[PDB]
Structures are given as structure tokens and as C-alpha cells.
Design an enzyme around this catalytic site. Structure first.
Site, PDB file in Angstrom:
ATOM      1  N   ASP A   8      -9.317  -1.867 -11.645  1.00  0.00           N
ATOM      2  CA  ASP A   8      -9.227  -1.614 -10.498  1.00  0.00           C
ATOM      3  C   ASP A   8      -9.624  -1.191  -9.908  1.00  0.00           C
ATOM      4  OD1 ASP A   8      -8.267   0.135  -8.040  1.00  0.00           O
ATOM      5  OD2 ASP A   8      -6.699   1.067  -9.576  1.00  0.00           O
TER       6      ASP A   8
ATOM      7  N   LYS B 251     -15.523  -0.438   0.358  1.00  0.00           N
ATOM      8  CA  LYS B 251     -13.815  -1.130   0.243  1.00  0.00           C
ATOM      9  C   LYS B 251     -13.333  -1.213   1.409  1.00  0.00           C
ATOM     10  CE  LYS B 251     -10.269  -1.254  -2.616  1.00  0.00           C
ATOM     11  NZ  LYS B 251      -8.590  -0.749  -3.475  1.00  0.00           N
TER      12      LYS B 251
ATOM     13  N   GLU C 153      -1.999  -4.143  -5.163  1.00  0.00           N
ATOM     14  CA  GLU C 153      -2.506  -2.864  -6.400  1.00  0.00           C
ATOM     15  C   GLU C 153      -0.670  -2.566  -6.316  1.00  0.00           C
ATOM     16  OE1 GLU C 153      -4.827  -0.115  -3.979  1.00  0.00           O
ATOM     17  OE2 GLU C 153      -6.702  -1.474  -5.156  1.00  0.00           O
TER      18      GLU C 153
ATOM     19  N   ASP D 139       1.254   5.236  -3.450  1.00  0.00           N
ATOM     20  CA  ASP D 139       0.018   5.030  -3.840  1.00  0.00           C
ATOM     21  C   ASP D 139      -1.201   6.632  -3.105  1.00  0.00           C
ATOM     22  OD1 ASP D 139      -2.540   4.751  -4.553  1.00  0.00           O
ATOM     23  OD2 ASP D 139      -2.923   2.623  -4.258  1.00  0.00           O
TER      24      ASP D 139
END
Length: 357
Positions: free
Chosen positions: A8, A70, A147, A170
């Protein structure tokens, strides 16, 4: 040979999971935590810090500390540090690298193969950057999984009727991703996404810090934001304050002798943050989630009554403020508990790594 780690590769926190006899087990960091801060820092001696010590020095070494790289994976983003530009692939590879090394230590073997997850809204350039990061770290990216996909895989969501409707909420540290999924024969496809790329646990903690500073100042007249060390422990206190309020109705903040006032008087931060106060404060941000939750619902034309299963990921979803909000949002349709929200995605990834091979 089919088993391999799932990663992850999160914005603020990365997690590794590994199938052990088919049972996905989350790998602990050398630092003693299964959750690794997605921060890569270059100490002013040529030393690569990945994880918590990068986080610890971040406030003083912001000059060479990269946090949330990211966010730039699909770009030409690079940071020139002491002669070498570290591209977003390379920086995230350093995370993967640390994460690989700990997994190696954990397992007692060299795992070369891995599924690494990416947000569903990442495009293929961004996925390619992730692949490249993997290869840079010595990982052979088996596949990239979205994800939300992984999150559904983590809970083993294989409906006996195949077809299934998943809401994946999320709330991570620095990002918010909402996604409605369609499951078919183990494949979890994306139908709609939405969210807030700047909303997460970082802002919920930040409001707790702001509150602490405001109340400290209110009592002493001191601007704690001017002292970086004051601010680092205020963030630690805030983090843990939120954590405590995930089950408790009250939490105590204790930071004695923080900084220095005009009269050198003992400045002990002693504050009681109630969960009710916490919500009075943080609901300014909780309310920001309602709109994108609804926008996914609207974009698919699927009512909450048509959702078969809800998955909450991101540790901030452990809060009762978020849980109850989800209950309103989904008409009481109950989110599946049993896998740590921060680890969920990694778990799914690990699972896909075994399914895939």
C-alpha cells in the site's frame, strides 16, 4: 511461489502485507510499527531516512525532506539534493526499498515480486511511474491494483451472486477518495470516483493543534507556531488525542514547559479535549466529505439501498464521528470491520499478488 507482498504505497503512510499460507499478514517496520510514514529525508551528511526518522527530522530538514511525493508520480517532478535529482519514481522507490528491506527481515527471505496499489484516479502514466519506482527498488511489479479494488479484496468480497456494489470510503492522512465498485468473479472494477485531494487526518489533527495553540495562547499570550519543537510535539499530542477520542469521550494533553514567555513562567500545556469539542471543531472538515460521497452515488445512479457492502479505509475512519457520518450516508448500511483501515489496502494487494500468480 505464488505468494508475494502487497504494498500500500500510501500518500502519507505506506503498509506491506504478505500471504502466509494464504493468510495476509501485515509486515512490521524495523521501527516497530506496521505503518510506515511515506517520507523520504536526506540528512545533512548524505544519510537516507525513510519512515519515522524522516518524519522526526522533517521540520528541521524540510530543505531535504520529501513528504507526499506520491502527489507528483505522473510528472517530471524531482528534487535536487546534493548533486542528484530524485524523481518521484525514485523517491517513492526509497519507500519501497525500506519497506522491502523490512519485509525481508520479517520474512527471512528476499521477496522480489509485489503488487503495489495506486488510487483509482491515477492514470497510466502515474501507474507506470509506480512500476518504475518498483523496479528502481528491486521489485518486480506484478500488477498495479487500484486501492478501492484492493480494499474490497481484503475483506474477501466474493459475493455468491458475483455481481456486488461496493462503497469504498478512503480517509487517509492527506487524501480523501470515494469510490463505487462493481465486483465480478473476483475482479473489482471502478464505476465512479470522487473526493478531496487535500482533505484527510492531517487536517483533523491540525485542528486539534490549532485548538491547543489557541487555548495555550489564550492563557499565556504565546504564539507556539513560532517554535518548531513546540509544534512537533503538539502534532504528536494531537495525533494521540484523536486516537484516544476514537473511543473515549475525553482526552488529556500534557506538554509541560513548552516554550519561553516574557516572565519565564512555567508554561504547562494542560488541556482537556472532549469528543464533543473535537467534533465542534472538526465537523468543518467532516462536512466536506458529504458532497463527494453523494457525487459518486449520483454519478452511478445507484441509491444507498442498492449498496451491498461498505468498506472504510484510512485510520481516520476509526473515529465515531466518521462512523456515524457513514451510517447517515449509507442509510445505516454497516461498514465491514475486522481489518485495520490503514492496512486494508495492503491486505488486498497481498491477496491479489497470490491470486494473480
Amino acid at each position: 511461489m505464488a505468494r508475494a507482498v502487497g504494498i500500500d504505497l500510501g500518500t502519507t503512510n505506506s503498509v506491506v502485507s504478505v500471504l502466509e499460507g494464504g493468510d495476509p499478514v501485515v509486515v512490521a517496520n524495523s521501527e516497530g510499527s506496521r505503518t510506515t510514514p511515506s517520507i523520504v529525508a536526506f540528512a545533512r551528511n548524505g544519510e537516507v531516512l525513510v519512515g519515522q526518522p524522516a518524519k522526526n527530522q522533517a521540520v528541521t530538514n524540510v530543505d531535504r525532506t520529501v513528504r507526499s511525493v506520491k502527489r507528483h508520480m505522473g510528472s517530471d517532478w524531482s528534487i535536487e539534493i546534493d548533486g542528484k535529482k530524485y524523481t518521484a519514481p525514485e523517491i517513492s522507490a526509497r519507500i519501497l526499498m525500506k519497506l522491502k528491506r523490512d519485509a525481508e527481515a520479517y520474512l527471512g527471505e528476499d521477496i522480489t515480486d509485489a503488487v503495489i496499489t495506486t488510487p483509482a484516479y491515477f492514470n497510466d502514466a502515474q501507474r507506470q511511474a509506480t512500476k518504475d519506482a518498483g523496479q528502481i527498488a528491486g521489485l518486480n511489479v506484478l500488477r498495479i491494483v487500484n486501492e478501492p479494488t484492493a480494499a474490497a479484496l481484503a475483506y474477501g468480497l466474493d459475493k455468491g451472486e458475483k455481481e456486488q456494489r461496493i462503497l469504498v470510503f478512503d480517509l487517509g492522512g492527506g487524501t480523501f477518495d470515494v469510490s463505487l465498485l462493481e465486483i465480478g468473479e473476483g475482479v473489482v472494477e471502478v464505476r465512479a470516483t470522487s473526493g478531496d485531494n487535500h482533505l484527510g487526518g492531517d487536517d483533523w489533527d491540525q485542528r486539534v493543534v490549532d485548538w491547543l495553540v489557541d487555548k495555550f495562547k489564550g492563557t499565556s499570550g504565546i504564539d507556539l507556531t513560532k517554535d518548531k519543537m513546540a509544534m512537533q510535539r503538539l502534532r504528536e499530542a494531537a495525533e494521540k488525542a484523536k486516537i484516544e477520542l476514537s473511543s473515549s469521550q475525553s482526552t488529556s494533553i500534557n506538554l509541560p514547559y513548552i516554550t519561553v514567555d516574557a516572565d519565564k513562567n512555567p508554561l504547562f500545556l494542560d488541556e482537556q479535549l472532549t469528543r464533543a469539542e473535537f467534533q465542534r471543531i472538526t465537523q468543518d472538515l467532516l462536512d466536506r466529505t458529504r458532497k463527494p460521497f453523494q457525487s459518486v452515488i449520483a454519478d452511478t445512479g445507484i441509491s444507498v439501498s442498492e449498496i451491498d457492502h461498505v468498506v472504510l479505509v484510512g485510520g481516520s475512519t476509526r473515529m465515531p464521528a466518521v462512523t456515524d457520518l457513514v451510517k447517515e450516508l449509507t442509510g445505516g448500511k454497516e461498514p465491514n470491520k475486522g481489518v485495520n483501515p490503514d492496512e486494508v489496502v495492503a491486505v488486498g494487494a497481498a491477496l491479489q499478488a497470490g491470486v494473480l500468480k
